[PDB]
Symmetry: C3
Subunit: 250 residues, 3 copies
């Protein structure tokens, strides 16, 4: 099987659990490699309509287990590129501490559900390093330049509620409610028109990399595709029937 | 005349009213075409110093009246390009429901005045489609990536006050106050240095598409232009006279 | 010496004080030139680990002392490029009114500490001009498109607490506390791993100008550099010693 993570499809959600609980799920070469493979697996599997990444144990992910360039390009780049190109929704279920590259991973996901005991630690600066695995590409796109610099430079840990105030949490979930609310959010996404969700992620990528004029040409192509989909014709037949749509993801 | 919209200059404001009230001002081929023409008209008219877009009836615009690519490139692209290149200020006076491409249109305007009964519905996903007519180009530039994805993916309707909290409303206006506050806001803009306002819109476009170094060269050119303007010399003569400036828009 | 500014290194912080108090520290050709030189000086000095820019007297900077293009390209462009390429942290200690290009200068800094009596005045529009010296490049990257347009177009002055609400202040400092809190914030930064801070500023620049794929290659190169640094090996030796790290900035 996988050795540093757990990959389990339950219903139509792939549960990707980071699994080195004694080391707070800190990344190693094979965790990096397994996460990459699992993300590509989830992307290729027609039965997978949502992905959840969460940590085993008390923490979400403490980042690198403690040439830095080579570490990044050989281990982290393939993983972050797989995540970045994955066209299924991905929820970071941040069950506890996310620090370093663990914070990076959470920022790269589409939704972040923070348990009431979770926290984000942009800890790189305290060992004289820079935020990495994509951190400074994502962070200002979520919080603007000033807050991203403050986080990266001052390195101060943020609580779940402080993360929510910053715009870094989709929601904060009480501990007793954790397992059920996470599952319901993931199942709720896994029931939506998955192909339209992938195309909107594609378009959000286009939005950050292209000009307005070219963007509209990309958009029109995405909509020709969504429009041909079975889910679209279910959505229209259910609207024009005062009925609840049943979507399949194609 | 125009048949699906009303275009009326009152004072120095062009009132562009979307006018298919029985279908909640939903777009058709000729509404798309008329809005395009009217925006270009307003842009070319030296007497027009502000534009207001609003909906007749209860709603602002319910979006497409219900090949998707061809629909977008042939109808919506010319309209959104006309809006995007228009260098006069444009206020979306969102009098009621804005859904689908109606929400898109509102996001593309410079200011959004929401009546207390208005709402934004990113409804595309519920029929298995993607937000379009520029939606995902504008939205993350207003609310950041995470909130834009949440809106696009979960598709949940937002109230006027929730839109204001998200940074999607310039202000929320009580119903009894609606007609007067909208007119005063538009007249207030129509009295400002319209040529400087067009150049700042030009520069905001440059800001999103160019690098810092090139940006400064674009800025210097815009300021040479604003500096030659009659409005600039009125502004300086009124400052150095403890007086209220009277601007003409050139 | 310098004539329109004061440049003084105290400890490891360069205090760059704008110094035309009778004209509210408004820029002239030689203030522009001196600030440029001083920023490059601070950047080249291994003993300087933080920069503070503040105004002498009651105001921070009222902007241009009252061909606009030539003014910008010959005076302001070199100054803003020096600031933009400076890889040491720069705090704008906004002691009072920042208006016009004075507001521009504050937005270009990494942190903005506002005294309780400071204010930001995007005043350009009231003389028929556009916000300049980089204003519209920085501003939407801090507050999003809508608020940047509202500020630029309506030109309404904002209080310290309103700036904090907008995301334009790192913090608001009471008047009695001003001198000490500013010094402690600057000294606190001057003690951090300055080379990692410069590399994160480099990466924030890369983040706004490059694509995701290229960004990761830039990041890996920055981290190879931070990783070789003496500060990094101090940070690791102090973590693995339950000890407070002592950083030198190399």
């Amino acid at each position: 099987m996988y050795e540093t993570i757990r990959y389990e499809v339950k219903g139509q959600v792939a549960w990707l659990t980071l699994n080195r609980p004694d080391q707070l799920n800190a990344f190693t070469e094979q965790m990096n490699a397994e996460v990459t493979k699992a993300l590509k697996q989830a992307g290729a599997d027609p039965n997978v309509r949502c992905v959840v990444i969460t940590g085993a144990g008390r923490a979400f992910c403490a980042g690198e287990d403690l040439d830095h360039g080579d570490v990044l390009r050989s281990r982290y780049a393939p993983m972050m590129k797989a995540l970045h190109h994955l066209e299924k929704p991905v929820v970071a279920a941040v069950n506890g501490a996310a620090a370093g590259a663990g914070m990076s991973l959470a920022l790269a996901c589409d939704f972040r559900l923070l348990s009431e005991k979770a926290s984000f630690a942009p800890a790189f600066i305290h060992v004289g390093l820079v935020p990495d695995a994509g951190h400074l590409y994502y962070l200002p796109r979520l919080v603007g330049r000033a807050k991203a610099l403050e986080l990266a430079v001052l390195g101060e840990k943020v609580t779940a509620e402080e993360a929510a105030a910053l715009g870094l949490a989709t929601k904060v979930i009480p501990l007793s409610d954790w397992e059920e609310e996470v599952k319901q959010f993931a199942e709720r996404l896994s029931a939506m028109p998955t192909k339209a969700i992938g195309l909107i992620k594609r378009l959000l990528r286009e939005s950050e990399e292209t000009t307005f004029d070219r963007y509209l040409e990309r958009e029109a192509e995405c909509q020709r595709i969504a429009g041909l989909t079975s889910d679209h014709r279910e959505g229209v037949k259910a609207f024009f029937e005062k009925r609840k749509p049943l979507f399949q993801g194609n």
